[PDB]
Each structure stands twice: as C-alpha cells, then as structure tokens.
Write a protein that binds this ligand. Structure first.
Ligand SMILES: O=[N+]([O-])c1ccc(CSc2ncnc3c2ncn3[C@@H]2O[C@H](CO)[C@@H](O)[C@H]2O)cc1
Length: 365
C-alpha cells in the first residue's frame, strides 16, 4: 500500500474541494440575489426559503444514500451528481445576463438550490462512503478539501468587495469559477482507476449505527452548535465593511481549514478515546461566549466581551475545534466498524453531519 506521489490523497482532497466550492460560492452570492430581487418581499424571505430548500433535500437525499448506496455504482453516483451540479451552475451563470422578473428569478433560484443540495447530498455521501474504505488520512483529505473551499470563498468575497465590481459581475465570476472547479473535480475523479493505490483499497443499518453512534452523534452536535452560531449570529458583531468579513468569515475558514487539515497527520486523542465526545460537548461554551460579544444592535443581552480581540480569539478556537473534531469523527466513524460496512458507516456519518447542519439551521432561526 504505497500512495505514490500521494496521488489518491491529492485527488480525494480535490474531491472535497469540489463538494463545497460550488455551493459555498452560491452562498457568497447572496448579496447579488437579494439585490436583484430588490428590483414580505422576496428578498426579505430569500434566506429563510433558501435554508428550507437546502437543508430538506440535503437531509432527505443523504438519508436515502445511507440506505441505498450499495445499489448504485459509485462512479454513477459521483459523476452524475457532479455533472448535474455543473449544469445547474452553468444555468445560474447564464441567468445573470438574461432579464427576468423578481418572482421567476426567485423561484428558479430556489429550484436550482434544491437540485444543488440534492445532487450534492448524494455526492458528499458517496464521497465519504468511499473514503471510509481508505485510511483515515483519506477522509481527512476530503475534510481538508472542504476547508480549502471555504477559504477560497472567503477570499473571493473580500476581493469582490475590494475590486469595486458590480454584484452581478462578481457573481458571474463566482458561478464560472464554480463550473471550472466542478470540471476539474470530474477530471480528477476520472484519474483514480489508473492508480494502483486506489485499486488496492477498492478491492443492518441499525447495527452499523449502534457501533458508530457515539461519533455520529458527536459530529451531529458539532455542526448543530457551529451552524447555530455561525454565520447567522456572528455576522451581527460590530467593531469596538471589512471588519465583519475578515474577522468572521476569514478567521473561521482559515482556522477550520487548518483544523480539518491537521487530522491528516495528527489524530489525537484517537478513535476509542472518550476525550473526543468530551471536547465536542465542551464546545457548548462557545454559545454564551460568542453570544456575549460586541453584537449590535443589542437588545436582550449585554456585551461582556466588547474588545474585538475576544471575538477573534473565540472565533479561532471555535472554528478550529469545529474542523478538528469533525474531521476526527468523520475519520474514525468508518474505522469503528468492519471493512464490509465502512462504506455504509461513512455514508451514515455524512447524514448525521448534515443533520447537525439542519438542526443548527433551525437553532440559528
Ligand atoms: O457538490 N455540491 O455542489 C454540493 C455538495 C454538498 C452540499 C451540501 S452543503 C454542506 N455540506 C457539508 N458541509 C457544509 C455544507 N455547508 C456548510 N458546511 C460546513 O459547515 C461548517 C460550518 O458550520 C463549515 O465548515 C462548512 O464546511 C451542497 C452542494
């Protein structure tokens, strides 16, 4: 078992990048959607409708994959999901240049979001089921790719604000970049069968869940907390146009990406250590901490940590805990079960992850 040139690993990393870089960009273009709808109102309900249509299909299709991934080849699932996402994003880019009233644009945007989240649900689940067969480092690879997707999203946001370009132009660029990335990801995947390291490892749900129940609930809780606090609540912090982006999104994405990466080479406390759920639980402390920072306009709660340094430090620790512990759970879940089931376990984990998102999306509401 020799991953020459780390090829397989690299590819998996790229794959991770491709799962969030398309959708992450879609979340970076929210200003553009709301500004085009400006032309009760659609813009005012846009975010809520988007979260609904994103988390419900995501959850449903991740569950269906957890149940039926064995029934469809992984090549089919992966390639088809990627092609569907690419086509949807190409249509998204086209619509930027075509005239369309606010209501048809709103509805078509929500349809594209439903399709993105569905196909990407199956794609993500299939990717984590695949990486479950490979060493833990190769699930850490997917997590690192996701972290880099977030990092690129943050940098692109900052540059779109700095470039002084029109929201339509910057959003067009976002969509085209996402399409190019999806093409690159497809190419990367197609280059897997030709790697002997990839062919070396490619050669009852209640029970599998009971075996990985601890780590599954762990990742679910991690993302519950994270999405309950980030970004809905953290974006309301004010200094005591570049403060919020840089101090919130940039810091979070940087430290989350680096944490997700560290799990590739350093995997403490391990898969059987009860310290991992303990740290996951300890992450609860970020709810009071982050809620008591310099939020404005503040009404029902005070500001105990007014200086921005508190906000930056809590953001660093929060994002890094998120990344590191989520990667550890995703890596150890498939390793807490026999080989013939590691593919299901992974898939199962991919569901709970999304659950942690959905619940978080509800708690942030
Ligand atoms: O291929 N596709 O087009 C595609 C693939 C998957 C999806 C599901 S969306 C998703 N799936 C996993 N993880 C996410 C997601 N959205 C935010 N996150 C993480 O939440 C943490 C903060 O709470 C951050 O670290 C983020 O990485 C949509 C589109």
């Amino acid at each position: 078992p020799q991953d020459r040139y780390k090829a397989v690993w690299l590819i998996f990393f790229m794959l991770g990048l491709g799962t969030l870089l398309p959708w992450n960009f879609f979340m970076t273009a929210t200003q553009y959607f709301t500004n085009r709808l400006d032309m009760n109102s659609l813009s005012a309900i846009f975010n809520n409708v988007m979260t609904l249509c994103a988390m419900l299909p995501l959850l449903l299709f991740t569950y269906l994959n957890s149940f039926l991934h064995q029934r469809i080849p992984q090549s089919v699932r992966i390639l088809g999901s990627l092609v569907a996402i690419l086509l949807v994003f190409l249509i998204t880019a086209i619509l930027v240049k075509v005239q369309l009233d606010a209501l048809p644009f709103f509805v078509i945007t929500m349809i594209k979001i439903v399709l993105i989240n569905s196909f990407g649900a199956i794609l993500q689940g299939s990717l984590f089921g695949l990486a479950g067969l490979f060493p833990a480092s190769y699930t850490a690879a997917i997590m690192s790719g996701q972290g880099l997707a977030g990092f690129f999203a943050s940098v692109a946001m900052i540059c779109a604000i700095a470039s002084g370009s029109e929201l339509s132009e910057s959003a067009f660029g976002y969509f085209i970049t996402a399409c190019a990335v999806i093409i690159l990801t497809i190419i990367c995947y197609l280059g897997l069968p030709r790697l002997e390291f990839y062919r070396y490892y490619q050669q009852s749900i209640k029970a599998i869940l009971k075996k990985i129940s601890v780590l599954a609930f762990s990742v679910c809780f991690i993302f519950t907390i994270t999405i309950g606090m980030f970004p809905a609540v953290t974006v309301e912090v004010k200094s005591s146009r570049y403060f919020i982006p840089v101090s919130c999104f940039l810091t979070f994405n940087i430290f989350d990406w680096l944490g997700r990466s560290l799990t590739a080479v350093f995997m403490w406390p391990g898969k059987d250590s009860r310290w991992l759920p303990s740290l996951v639980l300890a992450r609860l402390v970020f709810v009071p901490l982050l809620l008591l920072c310099n939020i404005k306009p503040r009404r029902y709660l005070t500001v105990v940590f007014e200086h921005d340094a508190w906000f930056i430090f809590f953001m660093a620790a929060f994002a890094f805990s998120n990344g590191y512990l989520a990667s550890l759970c995703m890596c150890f879940g498939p390793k807490k079960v026999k080989p013939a089931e590691a593919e299901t376990a992974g898939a199962i984990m991919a569901f709970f992850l999304c659950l942690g998102l959905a619940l978080g999306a509800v708690f942030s509401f």
